[PDB]
Symmetry: C2
Subunit: 95 residues, 2 copies
């Protein structure tokens, strides 16, 4: 079972997403601060680092997007639903 | 090894020309077409969702080109369907600086 760490305060997104993932294949946990895949809220992502991760953004901003991609991070911009996040987690870890 | 080849399937000629000029041609060679295909040399095909046939998939044991999809809009089931079919995507606005960075990240990771 691959380990997915969600770093977010969106508790409902964590629980509804985890419910959609087969626990024999994915083990989801939650964290307060910044695993096979880390999903991290932009608001909790340190500004000072490059990716060794999927980043969640509330809003579109061109500079923010360019900065994240250059630093090695893909992202989704809200709305982000449990079905979207479940399918994204699956696609990332299938590669 | 020579540059990686990126094929953009789009009618956004301005996005194409502006993105191509931001990419270092020693690392990335870009070309454009108006209907979905792959080419023997293509490492990555960047395809507008409006040009992406709905039946096709990017499979797990892929032996062909990677595909990144460009979407005009957000719709939940549209996004889930793309991801489940094997396609990552960007949703507009998509500027040349974003597309250049995305192409560069995708090809460095894959």
């Amino acid at each position: 079972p691959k380990h997915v760490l969600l770093v977010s305060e969106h508790w409902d997104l964590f629980f509804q997403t985890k419910e959609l993932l087969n626990p024999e294949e994915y083990r989801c946990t939650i964290g307060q601060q910044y695993a096979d895949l880390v999903v991290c809220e932009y608001s909790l992502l340190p500004r000072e680092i490059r990716s060794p991760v999927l980043v969640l953004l509330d809003f579109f901003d061109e500079e923010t997007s360019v900065d994240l991609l250059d630093r090695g991070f893909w992202y989704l911009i809200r709305p982000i639903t449990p079905r979207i996040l479940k399918s994204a987690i699956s696609l990332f870890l299938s590669q």
